[PDB]
Amino acid sequence: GMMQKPITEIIIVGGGTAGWITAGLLAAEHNVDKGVLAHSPKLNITLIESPDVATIGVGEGTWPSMRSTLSKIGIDENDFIRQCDASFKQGSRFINWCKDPQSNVADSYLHPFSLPHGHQELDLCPYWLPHAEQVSFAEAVCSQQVLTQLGLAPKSIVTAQYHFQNNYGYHLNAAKFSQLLTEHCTQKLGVTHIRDHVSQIINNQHGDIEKLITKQNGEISGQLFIDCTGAKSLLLGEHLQVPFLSQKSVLFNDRALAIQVPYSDANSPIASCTHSTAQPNGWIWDIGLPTRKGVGYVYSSSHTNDIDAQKTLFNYLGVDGAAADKLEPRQLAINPGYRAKCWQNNCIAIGMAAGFIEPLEASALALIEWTASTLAQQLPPNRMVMDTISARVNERYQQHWQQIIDFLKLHYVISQRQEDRYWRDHRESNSIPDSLQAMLELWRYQTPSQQDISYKEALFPAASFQYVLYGMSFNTQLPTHVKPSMQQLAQRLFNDNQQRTQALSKNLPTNRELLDKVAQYGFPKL
Numbered sequence: 066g067m068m069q070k071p072i073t074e075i076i077i078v079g080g081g082t083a084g085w086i087t088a089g090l091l092a093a094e095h096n097v098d099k100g101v102l103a104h105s106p107k108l109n110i111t112l113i114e115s116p117d118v119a120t121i122g123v124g125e126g127t128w129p130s131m132r133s134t135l136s137k138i139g140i141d142e143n144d145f146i147r148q149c150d151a152s153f154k155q156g157s158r159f160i161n162w163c164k165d166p167q168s169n170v171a172d173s174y175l176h177p178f179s180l181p182h183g184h185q186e187l188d189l190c191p192y193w194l195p196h197a198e199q200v201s202f203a204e205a206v207c208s209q210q211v212l213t214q215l216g217l218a219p220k221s222i223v224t225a226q227y228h229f230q231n232n233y234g235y236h237l238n239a240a241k242f243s244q245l246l247t248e249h250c251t252q253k254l255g256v257t258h259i260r261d262h263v264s265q266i267i268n269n270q271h272g273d274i275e276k277l278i279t280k281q282n283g284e285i286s287g288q289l290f291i292d293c294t295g296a297k298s299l300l301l302g303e304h305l306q307v308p309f310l311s312q313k314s315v316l317f318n319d320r321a322l323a324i325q326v327p328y329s330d331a332n333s334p335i336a337s338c339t340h341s342t343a344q345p346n347g348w349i350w351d352i353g354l355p356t357r358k359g360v361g362y363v364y365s366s367s368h369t370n371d372i373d374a375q376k377t378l379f380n381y382l383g384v385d386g387a388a389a390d391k392l393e394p395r396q397l398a399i400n401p402g403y404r405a406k407c408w409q410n411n412c413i414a415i416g417m418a419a420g421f422i423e424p425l426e427a428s429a430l431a432l433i434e435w436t437a438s439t440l441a442q443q444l445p446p447n448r449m450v451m452d453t454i455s456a457r458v459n460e461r462y463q464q465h466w467q468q469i470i471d472f473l474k475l476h477y478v479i480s481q482r483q484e485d486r487y488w489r490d491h492r493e494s495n496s497i498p499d500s501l502q503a504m505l506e507l508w509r510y511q512t513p514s515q516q517d518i519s520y521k522e523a524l525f526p527a528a529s530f531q532y533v534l535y536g537m538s539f540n541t542q543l544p545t546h547v548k549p550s551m552q553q554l555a556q557r558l559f560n561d562n563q564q565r566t567q568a569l570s571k572n573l574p575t576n577r578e579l580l581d582k583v584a585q586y587g588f589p590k591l
């Protein structure tokens with residue numbers, strides 16, 4: 066019967082990166098073999114996009130997962146870079162997060178995308194710990210600290226598409242990316258595109274969504290509905306009443322003031338990483354695209370008004386007077402948090418419809434990729450068994466969100482900043498999740514490790530926690546009774562990292578010099 070009917074009719078409500086990444090990943094996984102669309106494909110995928118003009122952004126970052134997403138969808142890296150105003154991102158550099166700023170005291174550390182050297186052989190972190198006053202964790206275990214300081218790229222012009230010398234994601238223009246995906250998905254992957262409004266959402270007798278009545282395209286029936294409607298969460302949050310779990314009592318930030326910033330020169334250097342520079346009441350992001358930068362101040366309205374926040378943004382930009390008066394930064398207000406589940410009945414939320422917080426550590430596109438790829442890998446056979454799959458997807462989703470909140474909060478909690486109430490408040494226990502409190506206590510006595518994560522395929526590996534914890538000079542009790550053989554392995558791996566760093570520092574291009582050649586010639590396919 067109906068409950069045994071294969072799930073083939075898939076309706077995505079909303080476009081943007083959330084909707085089109087979903088469409089592409091689903092079509093590529095089920096409907097394409099060796100780049101060829103099946104004559105009679107498994108899935109019939111329709112995307113209904115509002116004809117209303119979308120909110121504009123000023124640049125967004127990704128994780129290295131995006132290389133895989135693009136490749137799976139079937140996008141050529143040169144085409145992507147050229148069409149989406151993209152540059153290479155090798156991690157996040159955190160400036161002035163640790164201490165109240167002093168003019169003669171450098172305060173910066175890197176959270177690189179590269180894993181610690183020799184990670185398959187030995188976790189170097191506890192072997193580095195005794196040497197913390199002599200060398201940074203990131204310098205000791207990876208090459209990206211040194212290479213990104215030098216403004217160098219993660220690969221050479223001779224390196225194959227999506228391959229690397231050091232792991233990388235991207236900085237990109239999201240609207241241009243959505244446009245590229247619309248073209249690819251509709252013209253090459255067989256996705257049906259409808260530009261219209263949804264006037265009614267109709268349920269069947271069991272409370273599943275059965276069909277949508279559009280304003281001018283009639284009734285669109287389906288079996289699985291993807292909510293990509295953004296923060297309004299029209300299907301999952303509103304129609305299905307899935308509760309929202311506010312995380313503002315942890316992160317505080319509920320504002321962003323954003324602006325695009327031209328480079329001073331047509332060939333100004335492009336930064337290798339996202340920059341995050343701490344301020345009295347939040348932090349400022351700085352994302353370098355080839356054509357310009359995107360800058361924004363994330364802040365807490367319960368700590369500062371908007372007038373003062375704007376002044377802080379303008380100070381960071383180095384503008385005042387008449388120059389500042391011509392600037393038009395854009396203000397957004399949110400309740401940071403996530404829906405209790407991403408999948409209810411036959412509806413799964415992807416993107417902001419599921420949750421959203423400040424872009425610290427760039428979780429937004431990573432969650433889109435995770436949710437879409439997971440659905441594509443776990444397409445339910447039918448409605449009868451769907452709840453077994455949605456339950457386990459929801460459990461993993463809940464694990465991810467707990468990890469995101471805790472990981473982001475970690476960045477604040479271990480600061481030594483004292484001058485501002487905002488920073489002092491971030492260290493108070495009522496703002497620290499119990500799960501993170503437990504870790505902070507444990508990590509006084511041992512390094513973060515894979516043992517701290519119970520489940521498969523975490524969004525952030527233990528290394529990310531190490532990079533932040535020790536980037537910010539957190540003290541961990543030294544291991545005792547260290548095994549000489551392992552000390553010797555560690556020393557070999559430290560040496561090897563040093564040698565690799567030196568070799569790469571002499572051979573890799575700057576970002577702009579590389580992007581110039583990508584524009585003109587491109588990376589090879591193989």
Ligand SMILES: [Cl-]
Pocket residue numbers: 121122123124125237238239240
């Ligand atoms: Cl953007």
